Design a protein around this nucleic acid. Structure first.
Ligand SMILES: [Zn+2]
Ligand SMILES: [Zn+2]
Lengths: 307, 144, 363
DNA sequence: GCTTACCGTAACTTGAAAGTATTT
DNA sequence: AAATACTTTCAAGTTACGGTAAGC
């Protein structure tokens, strides 16, 4: 009622005429808030669009026995119901817009040809490879499949940038990571969450574990029973969730034999790799009575080394 | 606020019945029903603050003149207890308007006037320990 | 100037704010019970009550004894019976612990709490910057303009606390809107390359009178059009008046509690202001002057990602483009230059591209 | 030869804000 | 057509893995 415009004539509600700064600003090129949101079209809208297009698009006989295949602007759009139809239908375009499920064989051709063509003129490649698509869809697939847009490696120079941003944009405990990723080059929210929470924090402690820390960790685990490590992290003085989980599970457990191998455990490990698989170690360790997940992988590598 | 007014009216009636008001006698009910455990529900911070402010506002509402002379003193005791046992770091505070203050002071001086110094000293201590927010109106206002 | 209800439960009759503040200070400060100082004691306080309350000393001693505070397992719900609240809380906690694996402070709850309570109890590093003892505190509500579809049903708002002795312009400066950072020219055949602070001219509307900003020479006046139109022939809004904004402070502003006043800045962008709950300064709130105004509430708006990557945030918006399926399609800086340029601007001629400073990242 | 912290991503998860199919 | 619902998304995290570059 009182939102926009605030001043509306009681009888009519037109609102005051345009300002001077308003007309100048619109003439410059700046866009309002309402110009960047557009309503989406429901299913019935698409059905009506298609049937109107079909109806619009001996000869007396030709009219009436027309098959639905062969046939398949302001007049329609205004009187029946206005340039999105000129784009929606031309880009929905039942006859020739078929973004079918991408079979695996087309992906290799798309990637190789995109790399060899210089990653340019996407209309040209989308017309060269003859893939029944558009230029946009090829680029979307190439970007979703791309393996060169991220970094996945933390250097010295970008840790400092992360620290500066998270120290100038931290209100209380609230840390907005997405605004940082906007200010942080070539990253995303997941990697910043990982880095700050696990490694880059000034508060956290990085070093060896003393027996007193071990005793406190054992008491905390016996309190909580090997679940909810984010709660357990509180008892241990400053160690992170990942440190506590990894240390307790794969280093400190009550019964996990460690040290040099023998012949019999080698027997079981080799057979079990040849049976449950070679690429996964969780199950391989799960059946092995003593050794853990990491130890089986290390031992297999040492086997390969010996060979 | 899951039905506070039920417990509030229960305690206020159980103390109305006596007609022998004194802080020796209200604290007996406060410990016999142990109303001081109402703030030990293992709650977070936001719910803690909201619950405390709702309880204090309700007790204040019950303090005002349009009640009897018996409810008002019990509600004053309830204000004292709730403000004193709330578990908050920046303790939430009761909300006094402007149209109330003159009559509140009149009631206080009338209560001091006749040898009833218990509630008198209670109110004086509440005022002296800077427990109030002096606002134009009791509740926040906005169209919707 | 007693502030009472005009409408039944929602509105307050107008009142000169300064008179209200002076009325409180005169009515209450005479006893010395509002001060901004953080804190044989027994018998001395006993003499104090025996002299102020004016009861014989015996009764004062008896009361200072029997009142006390002790007469009236921390976070555990006991078996206590006659507490409906405890029963309900216990049931909810049990149902919560049996139906959740990972329970902690969610992002929204911690956001709102750590936003509202992140300055209380602060003290001025300087000593000459501390707030006075009797100055007021006003809470204002500033509604967002509509940015998404849903804001048309449950429109959001932002809240900030403004003192009673500082001018209007110190709130005009601190109202954060994205429409002070829009730069979008038209970059189509020039991919590489002042802001919307070239022209800055705004105004308030409080109880009929317009407050304009004529500090620096610009297209300063903005309330002339409404004065021209809405009252010469309409005969519907009485009479308005002008007064330069940088001349008045908040005490002079005769207002009402809970009414939608106006704030129009940068042409036609309009925010609806709903002032509520003015009070006196306590000794707990952040005692300072260079932090006010400060905001204690905000909205966690979403962010727009590029239509192709769906991994970065949008930086360029293209209108009337022959590639994309939708008309206002947004892009990052990689998709744009990788799809729209063949080592040269405007691969296809019918193509408009503008920079796009999204609100979700600037709020 | 072995062990020991560190490293980094895939996939779940809690829940308000925002979409949107249906109601009289 | 106002009002009501259900199901999407967004953005903090949290957990379970796969390896690394070290140590004696
Ligand atoms: Zn604005
Ligand atoms: Zn992109």
């Amino acid at each position: 009622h009182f939102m926009k415009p605030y001043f509306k004539d009681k009888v009519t509600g037109v609102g005051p005429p345009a300002n001077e700064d308003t007309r100048e600003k619109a003439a410059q090129g700046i866009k309002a808030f309402e110009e960047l949101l557009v309503t989406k079209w429901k299913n019935w809208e698409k059905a009506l669009l298609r049937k109107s297009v079909v109806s619009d698009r001996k000869e007396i006989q030709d009219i009436n026995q027309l098959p639905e295949e062969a046939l398949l602007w302001e007049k329609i759009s205004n009187i029946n119901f206005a340039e999105e139809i000129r784009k929606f239908w031309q880009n929905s375009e039942h006859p020739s817009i078929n973004k079918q499920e991408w079979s695996r064989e087309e992906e290799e051709r798309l990637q190789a040809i995109a790399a060899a063509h210089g990653h340019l003129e996407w209309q040209k490649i989308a017309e060269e490879l003859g893939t029944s698509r558009s230029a946009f869809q090829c680029l979307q697939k190439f970007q979703q499949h791309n393996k060169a847009l991220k970094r996945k490696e933390w250097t010295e120079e970008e840790d400092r940038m992360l620290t500066q941003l998270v120290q100038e944009m931290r209100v209380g405990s609230h840390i907005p990571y997405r605004r940082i990723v906007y200010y942080m080059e070539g990253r995303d929210s997941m990697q910043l969450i990982y880095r700050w929470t696990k490694s880059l924090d000034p508060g956290l402690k990085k070093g060896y574990w003393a027996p007193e820390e071990d005793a406190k960790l054992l008491q905390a685990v016996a309190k909580y029973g090997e679940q909810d490590w984010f709660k357990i992290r509180e008892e241990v003085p400053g160690r992170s969730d990942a440190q506590c989980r990894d240390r307790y599970l794969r280093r400190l457990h009550f019964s996990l034999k460690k040290g040099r191998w023998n012949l019999k455990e080698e027997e079981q490990l080799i057979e079990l790799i040849e049976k449950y698989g070679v690429g996964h170690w969780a199950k391989i360790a799960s059946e092995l009575p003593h050794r853990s997940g990491s130890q089986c992988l290390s031992k297999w590598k040492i086997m390969m080394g010996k060979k | 606020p899951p039905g506070l007014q039920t417990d509030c009216e229960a305690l206020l009636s159980r103390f109305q019945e006596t007609d022998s008001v004194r802080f020796e006698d209200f604290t007996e009910l406060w410990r016999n029903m142990k109303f001081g455990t109402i703030f030990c529900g293992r709650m977070r911070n936001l719910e803690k603050n909201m619950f405390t402010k709702e309880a204090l506002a309700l007790a204040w509402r019950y303090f005002l003149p349009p009640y009897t002379f018996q409810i008002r003193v019990g509600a004053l005791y309830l204000l004292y207890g709730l403000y004193n046992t709330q578990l908050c770091q920046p303790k939430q505070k009761i909300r006094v308007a402007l149209k109330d203050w003159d009559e509140v002071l009149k009631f206080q001086q009338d209560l001091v006037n006749a040898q009833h110094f218990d509630a008198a000293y209670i109110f004086r201590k509440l005022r002296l320990d800077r427990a109030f927010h002096f606002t134009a109106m009791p509740k926040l206002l906005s169209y919707r | 100037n007693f502030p009472e209800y005009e409408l039944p439960e929602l509105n307050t009759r107008a009142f000169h704010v300064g008179a209200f503040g002076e009325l409180w200070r005169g009515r209450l400060r005479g006893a010395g019970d509002l001060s901004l100082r953080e804190p044989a004691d027994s018998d001395r306080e006993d003499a104090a009550v025996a002299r102020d309350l004016d009861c014989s000393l015996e009764a004062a001693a008896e009361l200072r004894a029997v009142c006390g505070l002790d007469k009236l397992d921390p976070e555990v719900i006991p078996e206590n019976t006659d507490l409906v609240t405890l029963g309900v809380r216990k049931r909810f906690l049990e149902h919560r612990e049996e139906t959740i694996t990972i329970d902690r402070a969610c992002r929204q709850e911690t956001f709102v709490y750590e936003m509202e309570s992140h300055a209380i109890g602060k003290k001025p590093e300087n000593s000459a910057d501390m707030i006075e003892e009797g100055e007021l505190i006003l809470s204002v509500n500033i509604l967002y303009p509509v940015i998404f579809h849903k804001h048309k049903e449950h429109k959001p708002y932002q809240t900030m606390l403004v003192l009673g002795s500082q001018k209007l312009t110190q709130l005009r400066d601190s109202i954060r809107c994205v429409s002070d950072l829009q730069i979008g020219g038209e970059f189509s055949n020039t991919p590489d390359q002042i802001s919307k602070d070239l022209y800055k001219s705004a105004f308030f509307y409080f109880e009929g009178t317009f407050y304009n900003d004529k500090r620096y020479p610009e297209c300063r006046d903005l309330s002339r059009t409404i004065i021209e139109w809405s009252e010469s022939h309409d005969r519907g809004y009485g009479k308005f008046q002008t007064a330069r904004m940088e001349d008045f402070t908040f005490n002079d502003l005769c207002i009402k509690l809970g009414f939608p006043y106006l704030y129009c800045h940068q042409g036609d962008c309009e925010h609806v202001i709903v002032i509520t709950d003015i009070r006196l300064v306590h000794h707990d709130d952040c005692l300072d002057r260079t932090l006010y105004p400060l905001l204690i509430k905000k909205h966690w708006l979403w962010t727009r990602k590029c239509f192709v990557c769906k991994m970065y945030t949008a930086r360029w918006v293209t209108n009337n483009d022959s590639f994309a399926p939708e008309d206002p399609c947004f892009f990052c800086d990689v998709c744009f230059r990788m799809l729209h340029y063949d080592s040269e601007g405007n691969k296809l001629g019918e193509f408009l591209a503008y920079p796009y400073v999204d609100p979700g990242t600037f709020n």
